[PDB]
Q: What sequence folds into this?
């Protein structure tokens, strides 16, 4: 509470913090509601406290460009630490300063479009698996829980595109590989405690207690070392990383850490976003029909999608983009200010976490007409030019943006094309309309999305 005078000293408005807790009791309706309320009450900048940690929210696009792009290497290089991580210190998304810059360099060629284009046939084959599993539920007119069927698909693409492991996870839900990979919210009892007692992280570190379950990581560390020495010697991210350390080059533990970070990144996020898209499509049947029409036009006779035909589909892009406006699953972007700086006329002291409230800026009425409405036309080739890339930031911006952005969009778009070539999706009576968001620390629905699936 001796850090609680900072924003008052700088003349920055904000909610008044409680001793020890700072402002965290205000998270009782989730990050997103608190961000919106603060933006409304206070304006273009505000300040609050995760316990003793000061967080400065910013909403000026010039200033957001300074933090995310212009001054990224110099000042704003790292996100805030969040819990004991053990050897996952070395994952690209956790690493800092020159170690991150090194790993970002080492893994960037892995995510080029050319490498992605070679991944498309592997991503395509489990679209086919996705359809047959869905068709089994559509012929037995039982409502479908999207998270399970899409989770199984996302998991299927990951195991294949990252290790070559080919599993029908939905029907082998309990293969040892699928078990570890699925398993284990910054507003759960643990992480709030860490925010009130962030002195306790080094405690857990010397104790080898890790927020990554130690059994999953132990399983994958040894799984990788088997794969590595079965390929060595006798198309996936592991090969791409194995070829990279065939040179400063990627250590062996370092390689495992990135493998682990890739698996989750796209397990729950791809799965989650595909469900938000199928919700919107089901409650906006005209948007759905217009997409089936575009897909049939570009790929007649249920022609298999290809890398090039996917980038041909403009309405598909508009649907994806608009969904990520309403549900940017990151919610906020964050960088720690490593040096006293003054950017766009505002002094920022060292150690402040600077925060871009994406969810709140994606639903700002001052940049978006009817911002709560699902309106893909916002992203039409005509109107797309009028959208500020520092207000709409579903993948971040700048040198620390989502390295997997192009893979994710291609992964999800192949997912939707195949599924819409063969099915229409319709609300049930058990479908939650309007969808309510979870009051927790994740951007996800209050209730899981359930929809009726009919065969075309
Ligand atoms: C719909 C899917 C996804 C969305 C919306 C998304 C969004 C984001 C966002 C908002 C960030 C923070 C960017 C920033 O701080 O400016 C991020 C970081 C990151 N994402 Fe994604 N992401 C997605 C999928 C993926 C996938 C499939 C991968 C596959 C490897 C991935 C890997 C990463 C990595 C490694 C980082 C950290 C980048 C760094 O620290 O250098 N993400 N993502
Ligand atoms: C989004 C937020 C900050 C509100 O709560 C978080 O969950 N904490 C993020 C870590 S998320 C997840 C956690 C994890 C899981 C397994 C191993 C290590 C870490 C993770 O693997 N993260 C990196 C890849 C990723 C995640 C989501 C989207 N794209 C890529 C901090 C963070 C959040 C989003 C992007 C980058 C970092």
A:
């Amino acid at each position: 509470t001796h850090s609680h005078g900072l924003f008052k000293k700088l003349g920055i408005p904000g909610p008044t913090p409680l001793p020890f807790l700072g402002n965290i009791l205000s998270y009782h309706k989730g990050f997103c509601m608190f961000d919106m309320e603060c933006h409304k009450k206070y304006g273009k900048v505000w300040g609050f406290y995760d316990g003793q940690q000061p967080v400065l929210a910013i909403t000026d696009p010039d200033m957001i460009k300074t933090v995310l792009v212009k001054e990224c290497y110099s000042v704003f290089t790292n996100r805030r630490p969040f819990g004991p991580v053990g050897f996952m210190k070395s994952a690209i998304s956790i690493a800092e300063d020159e170690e991150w810059k090194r790993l970002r360099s080492l893994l960037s060629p892995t995510f080029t479009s050319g490498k992605l284009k070679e991944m498309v046939p592997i991503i395509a084959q489990y679209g086919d698996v996705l359809v047959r599993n869905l068709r089994r539920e559509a012929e037995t007119g039982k409502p479908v829980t999207l998270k399970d069927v899409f989770g199984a698909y996302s998991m299927d693409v990951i195991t294949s595109t990252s290790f070559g492991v080919n599993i029908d996870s939905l029907n082998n839900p309990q293969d040892p590989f699928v078990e570890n990979t699925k398993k284990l919210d910054f507003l759960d009892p643990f992480f709030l405690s860490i925010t009130v007692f962030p002195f306790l992280i080094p405690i857990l570190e010397v104790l080898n207690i890790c927020v990554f379950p130690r059994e999953v990581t132990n399983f994958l560390r040894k799984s990788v070392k088997r794969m590595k020495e079965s390929r060595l010697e006798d198309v996936d991210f592991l090969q791409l990383m194995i070829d990279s350390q065939n040179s400063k080059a990627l250590s062996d533990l370092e390689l495992v850490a990135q493998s682990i970070i890739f698996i989750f990144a796209g397990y729950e996020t791809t799965s989650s976003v595909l469900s938000f898209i199928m919700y919107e499509l089901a409650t906006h049947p005209d948007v759905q029909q217009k997409l089936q029409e575009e897909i049939d036009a570009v790929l007649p006779n249920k022609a298999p999608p290809t890398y090039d035909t996917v980038l041909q589909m403009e309405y598909l892009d508009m649907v994806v983009n608009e969904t990520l406006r309403l549900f940017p699953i990151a919610m906020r972007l964050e960088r720690v200010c490593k040096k006293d700086v003054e950017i766009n006329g505002m002094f920022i002291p060292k150690g402040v976490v600077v925060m871009i409230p994406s969810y709140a800026l994606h639903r700002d009425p001052k940049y978006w007409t009817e911002p709560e409405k699902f309106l893909p036309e916002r992203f039409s080739k005509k109107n797309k030019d009028n959208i500020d890339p520092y207000i709409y930031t579903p993948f971040g911006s700048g040198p620390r943006n989502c390295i997997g952005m192009r893979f994710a969009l291609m992964n999800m778009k192949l997912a939707l094309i195949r599924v819409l070539q063969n099915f229409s999706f319709k609300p049930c009576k058990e479908t939650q309309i309007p969808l309510k968001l979870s009051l927790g620390g994740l951007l996800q629905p209050e209730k899981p999305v359930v929809l009726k699936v009919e065969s075309r």
Remarks:
- Residues 1-456 form a domain with the Cytochrome p450 fold (CATH 1.10.630.10).
- The longest helix spans residues 252-283.
